[PDB]
Design a protein around this ligand. Sequence first.
Ligand SMILES: *[C@@H]1O[C@H](CO)[C@@H](O)[C@H](O)[C@H]1NC(C)=O
Ligand SMILES: [Ca+2]
Length: 477
Amino acid sequence: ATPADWRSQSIYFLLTDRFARTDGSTTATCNTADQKYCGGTWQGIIDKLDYIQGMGFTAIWITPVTAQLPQTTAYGDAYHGYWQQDIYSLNENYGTADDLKALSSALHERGMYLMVDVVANHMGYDGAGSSVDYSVFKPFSSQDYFHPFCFIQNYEDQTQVEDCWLGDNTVSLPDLDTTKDVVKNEWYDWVGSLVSNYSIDGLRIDTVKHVQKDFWPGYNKAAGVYCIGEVLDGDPAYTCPYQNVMDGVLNYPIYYPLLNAFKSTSGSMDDLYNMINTVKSDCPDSTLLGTFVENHDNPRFASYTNDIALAKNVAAFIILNDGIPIIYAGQEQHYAGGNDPANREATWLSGYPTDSELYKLIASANAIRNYAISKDTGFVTYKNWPIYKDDTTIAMRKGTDGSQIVTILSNKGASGDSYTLSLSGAGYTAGQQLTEVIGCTTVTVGSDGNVPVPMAGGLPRVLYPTEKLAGSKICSS
Ligand SMILES: *[C@@H]1O[C@H](CO)[C@@H](O)[C@H](O)[C@H]1NC(C)=O
Ligand SMILES: [Ca+2]
């Protein structure tokens, strides 16, 4: 698929080893602290697609598929897939090439896209950087294809961040010399060949900031699909520019104030407010970025607060903000693991309850989003923008006039009081009836143009014109 095709997508991010086993067990042991392969496979994913698609997701992003280092390191196995050694072979732990082909097929059949996580920055190796036997890596079987050995000590030195190695002497990550044309051509031919042999619709590019920019354009072109990269920095000035060399990047600029705004009933609505506008103007295209508040490199949201209402609100923001929504497997089951490895819990251990509170919130949010796009070709391109905010609230508006979705979020929490917010600025016609598609209730725009929104239980409210819902099966009553 193309970037344009992706704008309208909703991503469910999962770790192949931790989503679903071929047998389907929901009790098979997976101690995150052991950092060992727990059994997740590609076939396991196919068997649980109903579960995923049932939340309104239109795509999935799975971790890297290349063959990893074999050893169980002092830090566990390469179950996460970021320690590759043979790029022309697949991690047999997940299955065969036929399984991977069958996975994308099952998806394309459901009208869903398949996004694959790929690493061009490094290989993995069990041991000190001085003991690396380069012949092990394929095709890059020589030390020349790599940068001289050194560990990145000063992350403020970009050249270092790009020329030195990640990891340490326990588990080092041999750093490829992405300036040598032999490397680039190999990587460009590989990625193109990869997307082709597995019918991949888009790519999530790992450690994008550790590889020099002039490498990414050709990679993105060779991929022949949409590429969203991981530039691990919350500074929009440093992160957004990468979209000039790659179709999109993960929205880490929004991530931090987003998390802080809803992780407690005293979060800063201001910071989120302003980051939204800053990104909207400074970033090449906010509608091509990826929104999230939870992933495998940060404590899960629930680790900060177990408040279900706050969880609903942050999840609602992720789905309604500009760009592509990205939910990390387990988030919908209120998982609360902390920093890696604690945040790589197996999804199956939850029992895949399709009636959990966040599973429903997400379904409802994705439903209205998916519907709106189906009737408004300008939605995905309409820059979300905040129309209101107070110490515990923020409201935004997105979508062509007459068909806009107006989202009201609150960090008051589950014990939030009940009151009426007179929302101004929504832009709906006076007297028009609206449907709050999360709780499925209506509200009528006042004569003055303001919308009396009933606030309670610190719940998120999402408005859309009731008349526009004619036909759909959103809030059938
Ligand atoms: C594409 O398929 C051929 C054989 O079917 C295989 O040899 C080649 O390595 C595959 N490309 C990649 C990068 O997997
Ligand atoms: Ca590098």
